Amino acid sequence: SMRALFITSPGLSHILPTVPLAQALRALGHEVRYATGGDIRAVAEAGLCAVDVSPGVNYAKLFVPPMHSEGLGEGFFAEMFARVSAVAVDGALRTARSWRPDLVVHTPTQGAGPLTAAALQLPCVELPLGPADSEPGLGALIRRAMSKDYERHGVTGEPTGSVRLTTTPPSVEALLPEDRRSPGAWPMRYVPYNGGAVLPDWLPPAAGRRRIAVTLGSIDALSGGIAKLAPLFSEVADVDAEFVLTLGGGDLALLGELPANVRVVEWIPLGALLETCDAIIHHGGSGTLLTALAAGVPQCVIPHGSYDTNRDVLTGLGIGFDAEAGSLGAEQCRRLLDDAGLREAALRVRQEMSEMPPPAETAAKLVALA
Amino acid sequence: QSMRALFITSPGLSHILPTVPLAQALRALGHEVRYATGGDIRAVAEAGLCAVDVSPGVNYAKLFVPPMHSEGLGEGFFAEMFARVSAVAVDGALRTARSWRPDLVVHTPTQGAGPLTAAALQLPCVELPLGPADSEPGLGALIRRAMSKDYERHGVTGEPTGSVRLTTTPPSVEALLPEDRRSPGAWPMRYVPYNGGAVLPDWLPPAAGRRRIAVTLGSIDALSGGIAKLAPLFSEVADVDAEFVLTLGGGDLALLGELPANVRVVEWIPLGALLETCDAIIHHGGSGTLLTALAAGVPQCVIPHGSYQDTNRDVLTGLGIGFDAEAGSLGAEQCRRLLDDAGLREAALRVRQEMSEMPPPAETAAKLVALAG
């Protein structure tokens, strides 16, 4: 059996899209082990095995410890990701030494991954969460910022191999800026993984009754973001459709009673939901976006520029459109459900995604590389 | 279009678990997997997969159980029993199949709702057994008969289109089974342990030159005054130059009473992960435990039930990978035998090699996609 060590960022959304691959390898009769922290339990809930490389560590404190200030760039974030990776290094190394992998899989911001691969002279595989996760020269910079961590464990090497995986289909890829394109990367089909579930009664869709998923995302929902959707839900009663709202932690009490045609659930796997849905309104999460694409379903994105890159994609491909929360209502919903061009394009991209090699295939490719 | 696979399984944990690799494999190929079961259903969810509860609220214990002169003290009794248990899944299985529209039904041998559903919708079905034990002759054919009333009600007059039988049993083990328990023409699939996912503990990585023996009674059998069995063993293990790892699986710890220093206790830990770091295993004769141990290429000691005459003794003996031992007479002697007897290890290793030559679940999944597609 080949042995694959998955060294990931502690965050749920970085972990989840690695599961298909891990799962795929186990399916080939090989061995998979994770080496992470934070939202590690998600690995266990996926039928896989994980080692906690940073027990007790408070990540929040770690992440967070200008007119004139320099270094308002990638360097700030590289530094930040280095501090977070730092607390995984020792753990990752002990595990790698005892468990002895043939291959390191890592996520782009997890600096412990290439460090470990370099230390043990193994190849590494970069597995990104999606299009957003393609910050230019991020990896090289994280490495630099971790110099002190490399030098302490006596690591002068570069890992053996450096494969980059991509789950982004070619047409989406084309619409990204040149410096965010990853050419020569191994394409792998995006296979939604959102968690396993005992599915509810109501999931199977009623006869001739259309359905719109509304998702806040696992993150922005707890900020106080449910408020955002108040205008929407003040007009949905007028819409000849069923709405499914996933809270993902958000406070219901912020708006309270919703119309009869709105169903509320805390969590449900997105892939499973969209299988039965006609359209989706969301926040612009990468995982949510790719999942929706995969489902071949029109999309509406409530943008928000605290920082997105997802406007030009939906527009460019013609699978969807953007809409400000304050001006979001029945009309957008109608457009989602009736606009033929949105559906065909959605379907078009889905087809493209299904032509990309599945994770099973990608796994076979790696097994030999190791 | 993804191919769609409906997994209709027995409500029991141990029947569910060995189906995961396959399901998992299909997802990996970019296809769709959905389970349709009850009872220990939440294990499906914890495996990263999706499930429909076909029998919510149902009390299974009441279902399973409500000499010299009675009659039919045979397979017919168990067929009838399995029919009653399957019965409560039928309606659910059918609704799901109708709405979800699978291309392929995957079932476990005692789950009668599986072939019923495959027959009703004229789909092929795939039998996936838990291991060698799960090969009662003509069990399926008899469950069907006992479920006649269930078939006739949903107006099912026909047979599923296809009937593929999977086997995770390696050829050498297969040869040592009685003829009527052999499944020839069955598609071989590599046994890939699946026991559940875990956040693995500190101590799992094994110390330098320190040998380790796993002791386990399983997910069941350790319950309700069954841990007592191992009291003689733990009264002698202190003498053994090795580390012992005991998995409680619900058993009352206090019953063993006093433990030596060289014994570590954990409630639960995935068996595959444990045995990777172990030199040998003492167990109860669990079918998933046995194949896992084989896969680990590891000598085995088995504790028999006095209630039923399993076939496991002859396999272990026949292959020379292990031996049997009564709980009352189980001690340091056997442990030493496990760790030092060269023949046990080589044989164990030999069978492991054989298992690794069988097609993995990924390959088997591909084969099915063609069968249904």
Ligand SMILES: O=c1ccn([C@H]2C[C@H](O)[C@@H](COP(=O)(O)OP(=O)(O)O)O2)c(=O)[nH]1
């Ligand atoms: O601590 C434990 C206890 C049980 N198991 C798993 C191993 C095995 O795959 C399953 C049960 O084994 P079985 O003998 O097939 O089932 P039963 O208990 O029904 O005999 O539970 C573990 O992984 N760790």
